[PDB]
């Protein structure tokens, strides 16, 4: 399995044509699962899930989708509330691929997209696995913006390698994961005019009209599927107190918390995350 | 595997001779694990872990120990702080069986014993799996005593079948698990003069001198092993808010919460509990 | 000041004529305040706020309104979501009496009504004082129904003196406040056929398809006024964990928690409660 | 009232002579109260409590004590656990001035000292008012170190004007309180060689083998007096989740949380803070 061997494009209609890039693996396997990556500058499907896609593709038909604004998907300068935008694009892709009801796995912004998708198209989303998710999180104790969100904002205003390394270091417990190679690769993708345009567009999208669409903690009481919330105890972007409304109100919720783990559970606790996800989605 | 085929006794010295009953299975397997049951009237090892012992014994050398006051272990009318008493008995058994460092699995009172054991004899306890545990739990939001503890107290004062059924119903989410057969079997064991004597002795043991020994949330910052806390979201005896000091202060802690699950995780979520415990203790 | 001397009636229109009873004191004081009582069987304005009306009436023009279904207000057999029904009745009274923007003080059910009113008619509500409030509370840790709600339901199905006493005992920290006289007085009011009709109508409304209007924790981010949340640490009906979403999402929120205090803050901490309310509402 | 008019010195003995500086006002008022300031670089009694001393001195005999290492009190290069060191200094002052049982008001580091004092010398401490206190706080949700503590450490390693400004900005909700004049005044006091010696001695003491005496969340169940915890909802140094163990375990605890308020409650909510403290301590 390589980036190039798994690479696919589709064109969907979201206020006009929208190119989506995704990775496909495990084509032999009956159970389809959709993977939605985190939203840090320069993030994309293959790098977000590099420790997961091969293991999951042994069990499932994996569709890892670059969200609009990321990777090789289109990077429009203008769009509405991001999670609803991304959810509409994914729904376009489900229809094109002939999918019915499919489980979704999403970290951070991708968790927000997975939830918005499961609320807007309830019959299309099966079981959800959500790692340090946006949208259904509401930090009952942590003052907003969090240390993590403030470092992301600083990069948006001053997109330097130093500001990117600072944001990456508050995303993990083990700061040695933030290697010079990782910083150089993320920064090369994040600093392009097309990426910076998307990065800011996405910021502006969460304030003003349709802010309510981002307050998904108000709505997840309506989810009827099993939902596995996964958190790093030391998440400094979407901290653990953000899990409590979702855990209380989602009828078939579970929560797993990992000590000595920040915001990148799928990287920092890859083996434990892989085994939880395989068991929760029925072993395939 | 039957109650009779697995039954064992040992005599240990705890302020004089103390008979301990336990169940042994998986004698072929290299990794020993000790199971410590919950403390409800009439509880014992075989009935507490009936959905777990056979599955665990495929992977591990299982020692499921009737705590002093329960099952076929001695039921003294007088003893100190219960968890320290039970921990001293277990340590006597470890020495007799020639055990070094062994992981422990404990629900409720047994979780309290497992923790007291891991604090008092730190080199003898490996990984801990603790389900709705006593002792390291401190209910930061729930007024004490909880609905669950009050129903246990009512049975101690008025040991009727009706008061026992009432206490059992607040221990599970799915009240159909509290069958007439289960109520009749627990009540027959709970109502014996020997059991009632132990039941009250144990009550009196948690107030007065050595109350600090029961406040293990003050001490678990010192635990150096991985610890898997497991809770039912709807636990009405040791509610979920009781997990937070332990999750914060134990360096290598994890937490799993099950929605639609009360105080008997090992029964109500037996399959998920079994798989979590097997993976966490290294698959054996 | 007596029940009789302060007693007033108004007729308002909510799907037809609705008689409201209220108590008026401190006439000619510059600032009007409306008090809304809790919803336990036999509750009413005068008995709910007897340790408060005389003191508040030194500073404020006090209107203590019997909500529909309570005291001498009309006791209809059917209504929609209770808080919106009560808020529509209160709006009728505000219009009839010519009130502009008035601060509201509400405990439990009355706190829910005060919030529903402040959301639906934002220009008519000033500062809110909410004591163990319903509606905007969501018990993130406590399994629902709570011990307090379960004892209320038990009375509703078997309206005996013993079941009322059991419900009143989980309302207070100091169970000596639950005197034979209090039990007798409340039982007499709660067991009339009209009062039972109202309590049975309350049950159907809370589990009808109108339930979303009750989930005011979803909506209080919209409140623009200062809001003083007041909780008994030992509240067993609406426990302290129910404060957290409102404290987080109301911009100008404050929270005060009293140790050694249950659900009846205005009785068990009457002096401290009076003093907080007088200062928060501007001294009068 | 001025810095100069209220300035007093005492010599006490803690492993040898120790000069303490304090401010005295309201002499001849029946009730003495001791104020203990927070621990930010350049902090001292007069600047910490300038919006409070004049008001409190109308009701109380105020002693505002510069803790060892701050203001004009001695700045030793080495000491044990800071709160016990400061509590031993305060006991020396109490004995020297002939004080009996005195209520204590402390913010942050000073709240830790007030608690250590109330635990070690229980007959000498009355009612406690603790604002965003250290020591008895344990951040159950917030990863440690907090954004606030990290900016303090950054100043300690690189004691520049820019790093001090960055630390002062996470102390307050309204960043306009952090004026060039405030930064200039604090930087001047914080960057003297004696003050840097004291701040470097503070660092070593908090990560020395004396750390257990700092974990006062383990011990405050012993406090017998009424304790008023006061928190800014937006506290980024000692965040609100740090209140929960103390609120649960102190028998006569109260908590007050101000929305739109950071770590400096006594500055950002000075009027409401003064009024709460005056009422709680008995009006004087």
């Amino acid at each position: 399995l390589t980036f190039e061997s798994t690479s696919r494009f589709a064109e969907v209609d979201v206020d006009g044509p929208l190119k989506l890039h995704y990775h496909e693996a495990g084509v032999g396997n009956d159970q389809t699962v959709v993977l939605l990556h985190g939203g840090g500058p320069g993030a994309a499907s293959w790098t977000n899930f590099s420790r997961n896609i091969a293991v999951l593709a042994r069990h499932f038909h994996v569709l890892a989708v670059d969200q609009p604004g990321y990777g090789h998907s289109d990077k429009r300068a203008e769009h509405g509330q991001f999670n609803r935008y991304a959810a509409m694009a994914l729904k376009g892709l489900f229809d094109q691929l002939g999918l019915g009801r499919v489980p979704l796995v999403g970290n951070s912004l991708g968790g927000g997209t997975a939830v918005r998708f499961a609320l807007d198209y309830p019959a299309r989303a099966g079981r959800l696995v959500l790692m340090g998710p946006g949208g259904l999180s509401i930090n009952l104790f942590a003052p907003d913006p969090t240390e993590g969100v403030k470092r992301l904002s600083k990069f948006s205003v001053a997109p330097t390698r130093e500001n990117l390394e600072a944001f990456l270091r508050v995303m993990v417990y083990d700061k040695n994961l933030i290697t010079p190679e990782l910083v150089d690769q993320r920064f090369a993708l994040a600093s392009t005019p097309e990426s910076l345009t998307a990065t800011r567009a996405m910021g502006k999208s969460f304030a003003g009209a349709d802010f309510e669409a981002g307050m998904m903690w108000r709505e997840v009481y309506r989810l009827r599927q099993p939902v596995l919330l996964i958190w790093g105890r030391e998440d400094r972007v979407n901290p653990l107190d953000g899990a409590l409304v979702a855990l209380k109100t989602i009828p078939r919720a579970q929560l797993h918390v990992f000590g000595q783990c920040g915001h990148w559970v799928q990287v920092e606790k890859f083996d434990e995350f892989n085994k939880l996800t395989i068991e929760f989605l029925g072993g395939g």
Side-chain angles (χ1 to χ4, degrees), chain A:
Chain A
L1 291 187
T2 70
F3 178 106
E4 285 79 20
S5 73
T6 61
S7 177
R8 303 279 181 283
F9 294 86
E11 190 177 343
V12 300
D13 174 32
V14 183
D15 189 1
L18 188 67
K19 180 164 44 59
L20 285 183
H21 180 243
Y22 63 99
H23 299 270
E24 178 169 30
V27 160
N29 300 319
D30 177 74
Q31 177 68 69
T32 301
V33 186
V34 169
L35 306 193
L36 303 169
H37 60 81
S45 306
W46 188 265
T47 55
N48 184 97
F49 290 116
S50 62
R51 301 191 178 177
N52 320 111
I53 288 172
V55 174
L56 291 176
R58 287 187 218 124
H59 292 102
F60 305 111
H61 173 228
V62 172
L63 295 177
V65 177
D66 291 350
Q67 288 175 86
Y70 293 86
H72 288 91
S73 299
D74 279 352
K75 308 191 177 179
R76 297 186 179 171
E78 200 188 13
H79 60 64
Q81 205 279 338
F82 181 80
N83 296 122
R84 183 154 273 162
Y85 172 48
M88 287 177 190
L90 187 56
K91 190 268 181 173
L93 181 68
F94 268 50
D95 283 348
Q96 197 172 117
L97 295 188
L99 300 182
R101 186 169 176 275
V102 177
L104 312 154
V105 178
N107 56 301
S108 189
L109 188 65
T113 299
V115 169
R116 186 79 262 156
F117 183 92
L119 291 169
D120 286 355
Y121 318 109
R124 311 303 289 281
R127 290 174 178 244
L128 306 184
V129 180
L130 305 173
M131 309 88 82
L136 71 175
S137 46
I138 172 168
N139 304 323
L140 298 175
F141 292 102
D144 298 302
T146 60
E147 176 189 15
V149 170
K150 289 200 294 183
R151 290 195 186 188
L152 285 154
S153 292
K154 179 159 190 201
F155 178 80
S156 280
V157 166
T160 66
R161 187 186 190 281
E162 185 173 323
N163 289 339
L164 190 53
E165 187 165 1
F167 134 81
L168 294 169
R169 282 167 57 83
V170 287
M171 277 196 312
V172 293
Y173 178 77
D174 179 10
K175 289 186 188 170
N176 298 340
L177 290 165
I178 310 306
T179 68
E181 289 90 346
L182 180 50
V183 173
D184 292 337
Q185 191 187 326
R186 283 286 293 265
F187 187 51
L189 296 166
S191 55
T192 71
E194 300 76 27
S195 296
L196 269 180
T197 292
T199 287
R200 282 138 181 187
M202 200 206 76
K204 294 189 179 188
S205 90
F206 284 109
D210 67 18
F211 74 74
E212 296 80 358
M215 304 173 74
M216 293 173 240
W217 52 270
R218 298 166 75 236
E219 290 178 66
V220 294
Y221 78 92
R222 299 180 54 65
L223 293 174
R224 297 310 301 172
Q225 65 263 78
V227 175
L228 177 54
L229 310 167
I230 314 185
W231 243 275
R233 185 180 63 193
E234 289 83 6
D235 193 320
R236 291 174 177 270
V237 183
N238 301 337
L240 178 55
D241 47 304
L244 299 180
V245 175
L247 175 62
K248 168 70 182 193
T249 59
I250 294 169
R252 298 174 73 186
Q254 297 177 41
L255 174 68
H256 200 93
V257 182
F258 292 109
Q260 301 188 335
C261 181
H263 187 59
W264 287 2
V265 166
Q266 82 287 353
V267 169
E268 304 174 66
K269 290 296 173 171
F270 68 98
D271 186 52
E272 299 95 331
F273 170 75
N274 290 340
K275 296 174 169 156
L276 277 174
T277 302
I278 291 164
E279 182 59 32
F280 184 76
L281 294 183

